[PDB]
Specification:
1 helix; Ubiquitin-like (UB roll); globular; alpha+beta
C-alpha cells in the first residue's frame, strides 16, 4: 500500500503490535521515522531488534533479510514514565 510494498510488525514492551508498510530498500532510520509517525517516539529514542540483533540506522531491511510478516521489537532508549 501507500507506505510500502511489504508488511512487517513492530512489537512493543506493553504487548502491542504495530503494522508497518515498508520496502526492502528502506533504511532502518526510515523505518524508525515510519514508527515515529505511528507512535510519536523520536527516531533517536528507538532501538529496533530483529532476532536478538540491534539494527543499525544506515543499513536497510534487505541487509538483515527482514521479510514479509516478520516482527521487529521496539525498545525505547530512555526509560518512559
Amino acid at each position: 500500500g501507500s507506505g510500502g510494498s511489504m508488511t512487517i510488525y513492530v512489537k512493543t514492551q506493553d504487548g502491542k503490535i504495530i503494522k508497518l508498510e515498508v520496502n526492502d530498500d528502506d533504511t532502518i532510520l526510515n523505518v524508525k521515522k515510519k514508527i515515529e509517525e505511528k507512535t510519536g517516539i523520536p527516531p533517536e529514542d528507538q532501538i529496533l531488534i530483529y532476532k536478538g540483533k540491534v539494527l543499525e540506522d544506515d543499513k536497510t531491511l534487505a541487509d538483515y533479510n527482514i521479510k514479509e510478516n516478520d516482527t521487529l521489537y521496539l525498545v525505547k532508549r530512555l526509560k518512559s514514565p
